[PDB]
Paper text:
The K163W mutation corresponds to R91W in human Orai1, which is a loss of function mutation that causes a severe combined immune deficiency-like disorder. To exclude the possibility that the crystal contacts in the H206A Oraicryst structure were responsible for the conformational changes we observed in the pore, we determined the structures of wild-type (WT) Oraicryst and K163W Oraicryst grown in the same crystal form (I41). Well-defined electron density maps of WT and K163W Oraicryst were obtained using non-crystallographic symmetry averaging of modest (6.9 and 6.1 Å, respectively) resolution diffraction data in the same manner as for the H206A Oraicryst structure. The structures of WT and K163W Oraicryst reveal an ‘unlatched-closed’ conformation of the channel that resembles a hybrid of the quiescent and open conformations: the ion pores are closed as in the quiescent conformation but the M4/M4-ext regions have conformations like those observed in the H206A Oraicryst structure. The conformation of the M1-M4a portion of the channel, however, is like the quiescent conformation, and as such, the pores of WT and K163W Oraicryst are closed and indistinguishable from the pore in the structure of the quiescent conformation. As in the quiescent conformation, anomalous difference electron density for an iron complex is observed in the basic region of the pore in the unlatched-closed conformation. The density is positioned roughly in the center of the basic region in the structure of WT Oraicryst and located in the lower portion of it in the structures of the K163W mutant, which removes the top ring of basic residues from the pore. The K163W mutation has no other apparent effect, and this is analogous to observations from structures of the quiescent conformation with and without the K163W mutation. Congruently, we observe that the corresponding K163W mutant of Drosophila Orai can adopt an unlatched conformation with a closed pore. The structures of the unlatched-closed conformation reveal that release of the latches does not necessarily open the pore: the pore is closed despite the M4b and M4-ext helices adopting the same conformation that they do in the H206A structure.
Numbering used by the authors:
A (entry chain C), B (entry chain D), C (entry chain E), D (entry chain F), E (entry chain A), F (entry chain B): 148 to 180, 191 to 219, 240 to 327
């Protein structure tokens, strides 16, 4: 039951962020209307989220952990892309009369972006260690039973 | 019960994406205001989602798997259309002064679009094989009982 | 319990689409600002959805199937109206400099619109037959008991 | 338990429509920027919904049926006001160059508006009769027991 | 369990109204772009809602009734501020060419605003009396047992 | 079970505020289009919320309290940033013709901002004391059993 709720809640959240972020991001582009980055970033941002949405459709009928990786990976990319997207918007929006201020946007971006990616690595690292920790603990317990068995 | 939750959660998600995507997409068109593609893509995008929404209405009262195909198919089309829609927006929005950058939008589109459709095929293929796998496994188990039966 | 969830989920979805579609549709009209069709379509679209919303208010306290028809009918109309609405937007938005491309919008509309209404008829027809099928099966079973009864 | 779910679901729906409708309606006014009607209708529309939202706050802690009337009444008013609001928008939006088309908006409004209010009266009337029907049926059953009692 | 659902449902509703109202209100200000009131009202409106959102974060981990007062109070303020906000928008939006119509907005505001605040007082008053009523009823019942006790 | 619902509800709320606030805030910037503050505040606001969204993805699979701190901290920052963001918008929006009124926005900001941060400290302080209170009460009860034990 614990696993059932995990997927159910995640499904709603996935479409929640993907749909809204893609919509607002799309509107952001039409409203404003370096150049290549803005176009590519926007297209990729939408595409990545769309992939996640599809995952919501396939997961319902349903190796399971494999797709889980695709969803988390895709969802994560969208978040990074959205962050990159807003950074470009600040640079592009002010790019006309505000170029001086535009720089502060990307400059401040690096600090949070690095921590964003770095934080994920630290968490993943701890998770990896735990898997190994259980691996050693599991075999040991089994060995104890094996020794007393004889 | 497992099946009940699958439909319940899916129903909310369907209207979730269909309603939001259609709304934002519609707003994207009015804000900006090759030419034929933009008009057709927008109209089709909305129509496809509307079909899915109706499916949410008919599924409640309720062969069942058949309609399931219509919903997944329609929902999937909307996602592809939305991706195509944003690609057109980038080309159209910049189409005025930014035509040069506009190309990068569609060019980058192909890469993700191919993977989007290709990924679905791979998943479906594995699903098809599993169905056949169970088919062979099922008859075999039944035969074992039939042999011992005699 | 199966019936309880059906209404509960449907209630959220109804307000979901009706509220969002009406809001975005309304915004679509103010942003842009044949002529008569656009005004009437927009007004009707909003009115139909509003009716559905009210249905959500009356259903809670609660012949039951009768109102169900009103909700499904009203909700269905809104979907058709929204589709018609976007079609008009494409024609009206481009109606200024883009009239040539504007035609493709309504032309492509017919194909999907016909399938949209036609698909509903097919589903309803099957439902009607089932009702009659059960009618014959029900009386037959009762007759069997009546015969053996004597 | 049946009563618990009724309030829980209604609470989410109330804020759902009230919040969204008020937000979009508010945006509709700023975008466009007979005259008095538009200003009053918009203000009243928002105020009515706000009242409903507050009701959601007071109902949680919690005569109960009395407040229920306030919520339904307020929510209903908002729906009627929103319908009136969009009708004004069509008239006002086109009011500049499109006056000829603007008339069709309010004209078509009356038809649906009358049915909207009239339909509610019919449903309420049937509900009132049912209350009386049970009243007569209840006393009759009690009398039967009283007669046999002696 | 009854108390658990009360908080769970309220949490979703709080963020629901606070997030949407703040977002739309913020957009309303940028779109339009007496003067001091508009600036202060908008800032306060957002701030009050933000406070409520934070309350949603603190309540999860969790004297309990005390915070409940803060949430209801903050949420209530936002509703009043939003109502005041729209009133200012009508006056400001028309304030340029539409001054004649702008007045009707604030004038009609007073009527509903007074009833909005007055209605709350009446409800609170009844609640206060009930607390005292139980106080007298509780001691009396206890005294009856004390008398017979001797 | 009590803990399960706490995370489930919080997950939906997190994405709820983060997604909406980021979207509306992003749109607020494009619509309007001291200078440096606006650019940095907007970028940081989005980045902080994105971090929270990712947390929603990692929490599902899942030391637990540690991440809880990151989510609450990140979510809290976004709220403060959003408040700061709107304050800047009022100053920037009016910054053109309305500079005189622009000051009232930031001035009024301080009052609520201080109370916003101060209120959190008071609540946290009480929580800290409670932890210590239980610490003393816990050891005391255990000691009583230890004494009677001998």
């Amino acid at each position: 039951w614990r696993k059932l709720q995990l997927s159910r809640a995640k499904l709603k959240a996935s479409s929640w962020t993907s749909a809204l972020l893609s919509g607002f991001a799309m509107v952001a582009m039409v409203e404003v209307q370096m150049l290549i980055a803005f176009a590519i970033c926007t297209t990729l941002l939408v595409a990545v989220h769309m992939l996640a949405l599809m995952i919501s459709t396939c997961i319902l009928p349903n190796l399971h952990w494999y797709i889980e990786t695709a969803w988390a990976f895709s969802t994560l990319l969208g978040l990074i892309l959205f962050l990159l997207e807003i950074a470009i918007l600040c640079w592009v929006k002010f790019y006309d009369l505000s170029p001086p201020a535009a720089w502060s946007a990307t400059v401040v971006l690096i600090p949070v972006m690095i921590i964003f990616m770095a934080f994920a690595i630290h968490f993943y690292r701890s998770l990896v260690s735990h898997k190994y920790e259980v691996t050693v603990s599991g075999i040991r317990e089994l060995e104890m039973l094996k020794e007393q068995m004889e």
